[PDB]
Amino acid sequence: GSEAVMEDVLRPLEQALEDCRGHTRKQVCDDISRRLALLQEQWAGGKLSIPVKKRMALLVQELSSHRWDAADDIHRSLMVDHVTEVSQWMVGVKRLIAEKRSLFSEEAANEEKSAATAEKNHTIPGFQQAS
């Protein structure tokens, strides 16, 4: 629109970071949470320019889904128009995107498996009875 309000932007943002904060072994907490609080005060007291809040609000729309590749688009858009205005906190935002890629590789298919995810054979017979 013409202006997004901090509240509606912040709630999905925190929850998105908190999906990553599950693994705090990737630095993700201190980095992104720091920039999270920096973002909110730049929005309020920093009095960020209108187009920046607008385009970032679009991120919030895609942020509710696994549209990490789409979240990159607004970064490309901001970098050309208003790069220096957002050059501080955008590092953690783009970092969130990069780290979330690895979460797709985390399979939770270990719920009582008797034959792996899709059958499993053993070349080791235990004892050399018939070999």
From Swiss-Prot:
Tissue expression notes: Highly expressed in liver and skeletal muscle and to a lesser extent in brain. Also expressed in both normal and tumorigenic breast epithelial cell lines. Significantly up-regulated in human tumors of the breast, ovary, and uterus.
Entry keyword set: Activator, Apoptosis, Cytoplasm, Nucleus, Phosphoprotein, Receptor, Ribonucleoprotein, Transcription, Transcription regulation
Keyword Ubl conjugation part of the UniProt annotation: no
Places the protein is found: Nucleus; Cytoplasm
Coiled-coil residue spans: none
GO MF, any single term: transcription coactivator activity
Keyword Transcription regulation on entry: yes
Gene Ontology cellular component terms for the protein in this record: cilium; cytoplasm; cytosol; intercellular bridge; intracellular membrane-bounded organelle; microtubule cytoskeleton; nucleoplasm; nucleus
Disordered as annotated region, ranges: 108-131
Biased composition (Basic and acidic residues): 108-122
GO annotation (BP), single: negative regulation of myoblast differentiation
Function comment: Functional RNA which acts as a transcriptional coactivator that selectively enhances steroid receptor-mediated transactivation ligand-independently through a mechanism involving the modulating N-terminal domain (AF-1) of steroid receptors. Also mediates transcriptional coactivation of steroid receptors ligand-dependently through the steroid-binding domain (AF-2). Enhances cellular proliferation and differentiation and promotes apoptosis in vivo. May play a role in tumorigenesis.
Family statement drawn from the similarity comment of this UniProt entry: Belongs to the SRA1 family.
Subunit structure: SRA1 RNA exists in a ribonucleoprotein complex containing NCOA1. The RNA also forms a complex with PUS1 and RARG in the nucleus. Interacts with AR.
Additional free-text comment from the UniProt record: Appears to be the first example of a new class of functional RNAs also able to encode a protein.
Stated name of the protein: Steroid receptor RNA activator 1
Chain's gene name: SRA1
